[PDB]
Subunit: 191 residues, 4 copies
């Protein structure tokens, strides 16, 4: 009854956009800076944010902040969080793992001279963790249905691939998500 507010970037909003695309939920994708910064300063004046951060998801009059929290909330509401107490935990635990490596990716750049370590050490290591998780479990990380963890893992590699998959299941899992019809469409349309 929905507005997503963020910068004109994937960033930490993209996973939320992927969820809405998957669920088929209509919303206004509001992007600053399509002086992004002046616009953000104004938004903060206009809107009551808890921590002066975006993304913000506003549903009617209700303001939701913090991307990971928003993801968990939506996932519960729309049945992509796992179907048992243990499965809900595993999905969460996997997402936390994705968060660790995703941040590391966002902390690697040329100036810092950490690209080679990321490419050679950190990413292979994390990819191995994910591949093993897939092996343990027309591919899902959790149970026999899609969860937000699947989308998160797709999003992580999709992001990484923009800038910079030895991992057979992970590759297959990524292809599978990319080809879900709602996802494929979203992706094709995406700037």
């Amino acid at each position: 009854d929905i507005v997503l507010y963020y910068f004109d970037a994937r960033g930490k909003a993209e996973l939320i956009r992927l969820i809405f695309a998957y669920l088929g939920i209509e919303y206004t994708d509001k992007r600053f800076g399509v002086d992004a910064f002046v616009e953000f300063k104004n938004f903060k004046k206009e809107k009551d944010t808890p921590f002066e951060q975006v993304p913000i998801l506003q549903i009617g009059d209700l303001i939701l902040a913090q991307s990971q929290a928003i993801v968990r909330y939506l996932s519960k509401k729309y049945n992509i969080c796992g179907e048992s107490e243990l499965n809900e935990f595993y999905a969460d635990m996997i997402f936390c793992g994705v968060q660790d490596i995703h941040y590391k990716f966002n902390n690697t750049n040329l100036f810092k001279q950490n690209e080679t370590t990321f490419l050679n050490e950190d990413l292979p290591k994390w990819s191995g963790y994910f591949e093993k998780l897939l092996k343990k479990n027309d591919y899902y990380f959790v149970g026999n249905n899609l969860t937000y963890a699947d989308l998160a893992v797709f999003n992580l590699y999709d992001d990484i691939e923009t800038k910079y998959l030895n991992f057979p299941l992970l590759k297959a899992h990524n292809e599978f998500i990319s080809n879900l019809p709602n996802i494929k469409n979203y992706i094709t349309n995406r700037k």
Copy 2:
């Protein structure tokens, strides 16, 4: 029916310890290095961890990883996550906020020359966010009962205070948590 594995430090395990103390749950608090590192390497060989990280909470044969996930799991199980869908979200959102500032605290040190900015800019700003959240809501962040967010906020400042509260509610809230009998006891006994 429970072992917590971590280093002999508060770190990211402390919030879990505070929850168990609050809930009155008996567990073995297993600390490496009471060559911490040799011991950790061995533990990783011995135990099947998803990401080769601690803390690990083992309940019977069940291995749980990722501190924030563990906290959410316990909180749901033991009714400290909020009593409505919206309240569960707010608790989560607050914890996410705590995570942001807690990390910043752990990223500030003398060598980096970022202590003054943290003390003068970042912490006051975050404390203001928390104070306002308390105002909005014989003190609780969420609803009218204790949630993990309360414990998290207590833990954050308690950590900060070891190394380095203008904020009346926050101070009062912190005192209140510190004085909950199970907490007070845990704290008095703690190395």
Copy 3:
């Protein structure tokens, strides 16, 4: 001689060196990884082929001599070509100032949307540093009329400050509140060897 600069096809930590060569009019080969191909493969092969101390670039090769670490290279060239200041104290001040540049420059490079630190960088870290530089320029009033950080000739510190703001500008918007600094950067940008290099870049 045969001077070759090796780096990625980016400004990064190489650009100041490139600016120095431009300013001095030194010819060199600007070898850039990844202009067309996979930058990482090229870098990997380079490391195999060239004996680098730390497996890092930039690398400046003069003849068969291999020099590493951008700041060290900058200091070496600056001494050689008389852009390091003309007294012991002035040499120190240029070095001081560059050290300060490095600090804020590293911060800029650690700033991004995902990390949600853009607003604090724009709003609180950069203005503070811009203030420090503005004050330093004031102390050299003044000799100035021409804007130099140190003494009455150009030093690498001048180039470094120019480069830092130039780099920032590529990503983020004014220097309105910092007139001395703004004039200084403009002045550097208009030195003919520099203006020409920039236009062609």
Copy 4:
């Protein structure tokens, strides 16, 4: 003269300067914030009282002269007191090496339990750097028999490498796999002015 070093009551970025003064036998006042009181209040008052370029310490004051930025201070002292190498190339190499030290040292300082990067630092970042240093020592075989990074006299790079490992050791455990580096550090640790300073520290 009246030489005063201002810093926190910590090693940090000051310690190398202190080691240099010890090695050279220069008397100075080692003023440390927070020995007894609130370090931040002391620092805040210092900044008000002293005109610092960047609102940072360390600060070295010689007479009324204020010098800032630890690396710049190290380079200035090293030139003055002949620990920077005795040729243009050797001066560059000592500087190169120090730049490398700074990189790994900063990483050590960014390593902690909360960030869960201790194992990668011990396991993968430090060994790699230790290797780089070990290889650099090998190149100076070579002159050595005495271990120096550069030429056949001590330079600040020697002190810097010693200091870096010493600092690491306070926090984390062997250098077993790096015999040249280990011997080098031991050798530095045993220079009489250094050994004495250390024992008293």
